Amino acid sequence: MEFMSAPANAVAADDATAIALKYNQDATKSERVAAARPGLPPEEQHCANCQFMQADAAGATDEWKGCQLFPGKLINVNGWSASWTLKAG
Template structure:
């Protein structure tokens, strides 16, 4: 899998900020990430995975969504849950971004 330096750095910043802030944020209080958020735009985040630009994000495959990503910090049945890629802002379970990593 080929990852650009920019994607790696953005992902690293998300993980580092999560570690720095800790995981004490309550899921119910966390803000939802907007598609217009700079990090969301850099990672190609969409609230609905079916709306991903498949030509631009060739890594995307049908069936990939935040709910089955290793970074998703909720249950797959949760509609929204925190994600460290977005400083623990909530992402949609049916969403997708280029940091997607299939849950083991």
């Protein structure tokens, strides 16, 4: 595989929105256990299985995808935020 470029509009650690929504690009380092959102055990929760992850957003790759709660941005498929909600598959 070729290296996966990091989008200029990916949510960053230094963004007020990320701080507000407790988003972390790496779910393993997130507060998912402390949040204890309902749906899946906490350590299985990440953007890849969240209701708001948008696979068809401008600039999306299999590593970077959109989120309906972060307009005009891109989150990491391995991330997590406190709005994590199991996708109604």
